[PDB]
Symmetry: D2
Subunit: 233 residues, 4 copies
Amino acid sequence: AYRLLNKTAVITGGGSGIGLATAKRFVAEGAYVFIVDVSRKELEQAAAEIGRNVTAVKADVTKLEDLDRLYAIVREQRGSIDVLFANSGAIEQKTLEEITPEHYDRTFDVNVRGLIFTVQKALPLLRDGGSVILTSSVAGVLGLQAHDTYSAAKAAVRSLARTWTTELKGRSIRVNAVSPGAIDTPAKFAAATPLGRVGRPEELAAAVLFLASDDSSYVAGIELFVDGGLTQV
Amino acid sequence: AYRLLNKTAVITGGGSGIGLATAKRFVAEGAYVFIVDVSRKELEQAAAEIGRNVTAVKADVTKLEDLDRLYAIVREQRGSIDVLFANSGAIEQKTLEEITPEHYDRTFDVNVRGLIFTVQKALPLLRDGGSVILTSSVAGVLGLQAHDTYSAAKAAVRSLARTWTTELKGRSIRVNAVSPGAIDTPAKFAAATPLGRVGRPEELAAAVLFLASDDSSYVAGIELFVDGGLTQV
Amino acid sequence: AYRLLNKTAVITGGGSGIGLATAKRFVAEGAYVFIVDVSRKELEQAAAEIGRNVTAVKADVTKLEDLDRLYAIVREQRGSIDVLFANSGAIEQKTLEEITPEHYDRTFDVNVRGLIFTVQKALPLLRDGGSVILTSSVAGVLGLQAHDTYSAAKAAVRSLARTWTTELKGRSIRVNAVSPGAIDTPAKFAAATPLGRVGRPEELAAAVLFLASDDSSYVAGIELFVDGGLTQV
Amino acid sequence: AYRLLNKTAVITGGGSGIGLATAKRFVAEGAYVFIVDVSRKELEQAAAEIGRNVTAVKADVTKLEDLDRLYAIVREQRGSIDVLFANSGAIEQKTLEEITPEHYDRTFDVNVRGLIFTVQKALPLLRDGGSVILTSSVAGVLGLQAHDTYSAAKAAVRSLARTWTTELKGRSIRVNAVSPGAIDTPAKFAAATPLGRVGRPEELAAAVLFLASDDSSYVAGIELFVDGGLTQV
């Protein structure tokens, strides 16, 4: 009944949207969860909503020193990590001719750099046999107007799942990417989507649970699309 | 606790290997299971192993009339299908120059023709919101010596999950393909596999469970690789 | 200037459309061409059009004996084959529920069976270092309404490039798939195509030329989409 | 006879390797080539090797002002660009745990940042109906030990081809990625490569030529693997 019973999870971008829904589903599956996000208020809100088996950590994942502090706290409170959901994502729309150094640095900092160090700094705490879920996107295999740097960064995220799969294999740590389509997070995607609707954060959390749990024990390096068929037809 | 509580599942190739493994896991999850295979004896053994909530049906899914009789039995005992796992596979190893018309016919009849019809005739029993999983293979994306027809036919399988995704969306039926790598069924594959081992049939069953269950509610038209990272790296 | 000077090419579906367009280009690049097709009239028109270095052979390539006759003619006139463009293809729209045994058989015969035996029976004639191009389709990676068997069969054709690449590597023979989008042969595809138009048969011929010629000597096993962007964005 | 007769090509990384191979082949095909790179010595040597119809321009394509300056020179000397080969590439091997912020910044600046601004700044000179080729890599779809950032950056590159295809379709500018496998540039990869050898730089230049020429006029948004079958089987 409790597919994650007594496992320790760390979830970044855990103050809202898909991170928050995964946190809630994880606690329901018997996990202890760390939610990590930038906004104090949102973390307090999110933790109260989760209500049990949860520590909230204020951290900007793009800042290395913030990650060291995160992982000291994790070390102190629970001692190790069974599941890491390295969830990050910020989309700013700009076409090629509109891109600035600035737009670029911010897109890649948040979507790639901070993901890379999130996972790097977590290695000393990851148990052998553990599971890492990277958030990529449908955008990482599409050519969408004005999504130049976002799509490119999320294709970078999916690649990291293959490299890490090779690198961490000696510790039996699985690394997989989840690639959400349109998720209803606080229409064109809905139009071309076979299931005919945006997905719910609940549905994305369920897909990450699979990747998190022993049910995906032979599943490694994959890109799991959770996009109601958007990219598959 | 029970992730297919009271759903009715149909599994073809249900008398052994991943079909049997899936049926045991499905019953564990509170589903009622129809196992379907060619051998009365194997089916009797299989049913005893599963032990409850199972009907065994002798059908050669490459024969249209056998599928008629299958679905009539399913219809009289349970009235509709929630999960159809259309699981077939016959592999015979011939290189291009060794291919006979009989080898071609048998390989495609069991892997493609029989699957098509299996799914066509399940249509009138399948519930709206139901889930259909097809058994593809990592061979469907690899260039493997002497696997000419089997690999070709398994790609045909993965393609059908796309077309069916588009054709059944009007009914909310999700169609997805599972692509197993090496599975231990009663070393070279294992050597190139990042998890470093063959998978257990129960690990394949678990991945089919995900597709079968509400956790995959926003997943449609995918190829789910269950191959320890073989095709991913 | 003459990219295929003194090369012997065999082209199936040679009497119209992409097959004829490829023959014409292959002739203008200095090749000696066999066009193979079922209709005498079309072949005579085609040979007249091509105008030089061409033998037209009336063969149904789904028939093993028509292939034996074809290749005895190839062997006696030109000896061995530098380039085989095993271009097959026919489509009939039927949804899953409309699928008949006749429909499936006819689709798989034309699109897969004949293609396997075409390439099988060319083996003793293929020069070492020669090039085999298969016609697949964008359909082999899409979920198109009512394209069930045509798409499934084209995916199979793409898979044969991979396996054949492994099997004939000893003889340095490259096998690659070409996947056309919409080609103009005497809107909806054109609507979703970035280039905003259907392809000319001449453009597909140019892509096949590339696989045919030395320019692609390091390219093997691939699926070259020629669809003005259809499957890529 | 001359496939780029009087076309203006801009090639970055043009002082060595596949850049230089491509410049040479392009001049053979009657183009006027600008070779762009960091080292004056290397540029001078490469310009003498090519021999005719070439300007060498010293530039760090990671610097916006060096690019403004490149395009001023191109604008003055030739007025417009028909073919842009945005070829960039630096690899340094580091495993995840070895990654420094500096290792990360260098890989992405060169392989991605530089690439974006290269094409962005080419836009006012690019003729309508022009052709843009981006160098990706087989690394972009593999999990190779210690290739974390390079493979990731190369997957970003492939994505950009998709996004640009959509952004630029209004001008009929085609954008495609070439993904080299192992290339002999001044055994492990040969081992898993169906062709059984490394690719020659001339062979990569031929493939880029295809993308640059009118033969690929209906080809957009693709990843063209030129890797002897490495990623295809």
